């Protein structure tokens, strides 16, 4: 049957995270899970499901994508996303977005409306205007929390995977990237086979230290272990997270064509949720 997983990012989420900051993030996870489950039960194809959920996770200011993107070194927002359809292996990606309200929707339009997969920076902003997507002033995306985070860094990702009852799979990832990143830095989120992958067998969205995820080709590696060694989703995701990538760098979510779900992480925490047709659902931050 159908299955959905989502994340609001992996990293060093401290156990002492105050309730005032925990609660809104938990509420956001549970609300996005309800949106994605409602969508699958309304017979929306998995590509529409992961777009719809990641649009919400972009709009949530407590998550690093869309509004609440982390700031470049220059105190600016540069947003990036990718989307992949497992059944066609069609895909779309964008980098260097500064005014586009929903980066993941622009990635979808590159896939549908152009002969290309990947547009970035000024050409991606020009395509956004040609398509008439929603834009706001760059100041919309910058939060007080992210101004402070950049100050402290100089001193010192969201995702959705879904499968319907017919084995159709999709993956969507969106980010502001890494605090204090150099202007023009591209991380793992928009790279097919790093942050995002979907094929006949699985759909994967990765989150964490961008450069490690690129070097590790994490999303492709999950799919490759299932295809080339006959590993189950759980075996393939476990091996990548706990065997092949360094501690404190990576988490991912994955669903299979058979409707299984895996959300392993090697970080302290990962803001995560999932639901299956088989009546499993969970919302979590830390290990249980």
């Amino acid at each position: 049957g159908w299955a959905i997983a989502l994340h609001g990012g992996a990293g060093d989420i401290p156990l002492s995270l105050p309730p005032e900051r925990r609660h809104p993030r938990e509420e956001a996870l549970r609300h996005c899970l309800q949106i994605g489950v409602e969508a699958l039960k309304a017979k929306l194809p998995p590509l529409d499901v992961v777009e719809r959920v990641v649009r919400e996770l972009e709009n949530i200011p407590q998550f690093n994508a869309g509004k609440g993107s982390v700031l470049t070194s220059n105190g600016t927002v540069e947003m990036e996303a990718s989307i992949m359809d497992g059944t066609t292996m069609d895909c779309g990606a964008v980098s260097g977005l500064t005014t586009v309200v929903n980066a993941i929707s622009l990635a979808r339009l590159v896939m549908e409306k152009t002969p290309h997969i990947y547009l970035a920076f000024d050409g991606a902003e020009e395509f956004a205007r040609q398509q008439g997507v929603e834009t706001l002033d760059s100041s919309h995306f910058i939060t007080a929390e992210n101004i402070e985070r950049l100050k402290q860094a100089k001193e010192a990702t969201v995702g959705c995977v879904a499968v319907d009852g017919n084995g159709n799979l999709a993956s969507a990832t969106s980010t502001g990237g890494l605090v204090n990143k150099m202007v023009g830095r591209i991380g793992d989120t928009p790279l097919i086979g790093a942050g995002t992958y979907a094929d006949a067998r699985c759909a994967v969205s990765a989150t964490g230290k961008g450069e490690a995820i690129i070097r590790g080709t994490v999303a492709r590696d999950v799919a490759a272990l299932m295809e080339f060694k006959g590993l189950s989703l759980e075996e393939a995701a476990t091996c990548v997270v706990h065997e092949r990538t360094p501690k404190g760098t990576l988490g991912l979510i994955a669903v299979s064509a058979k409707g299984e779900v895996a959300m392993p992480y090697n970080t302290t925490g990962m803001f995560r949720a999932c639901a299956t047709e088989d009546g499993y659902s969970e919302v979590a931050i830390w290990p249980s």
Copy 2:
């Protein structure tokens, strides 16, 4: 078995009737650039320096779609991209959106060496280039008469690389391109994406060429390495499986070397401008199938 090097000047529908005056300089360029890599490997230059030196020269040859001679965007502009990977460390570097940088591959290497990042693109990459003091020239330098005409033909109708291994099994890959003629401004292809156009690990080094979007979707360079690592396929078995089973005909060619000094250069296109050499005394320059 000792050192080995392979290089390409791109794969695609190179017609069997390609007249001598387009074939000639490209075959000579392959032989010239192979000499650069052979002399470097005979001098025991690290593979990462070998592939950078060869691809710099391939960028400079105006008949190849990289550096000077890069194909034109829809707007008649050059937007250049490159990636480089060290198989021993899996250290890598990538650049997209370069308009004035003479050698894209060398800025990919500086990202890897001088920053905490793998990949810089467009204004931020051009600004890193200026901080680093690398050679830049006016955007008009990169535009050739041949590519003005190619773009005119594309609107009407509507890659280079090097892999090297030393006798100690150290592996490197480098790939540089103008991209696709009449591409939208800001379009990124496979060349700068680690695991699509470029990959190196302890077992192999891979550079891919052909239709960017097919190579992204097929994660070609990573797939060769994954079949060797996860199925125990030879370099040849893995390379041939990717090109002749896992990807559409007419889209892709690749060059690859193994830790053991094996060479493979399969393609599913009409042709692929290619050359290789091994310490065992083999060398080859070719365009079409034998």
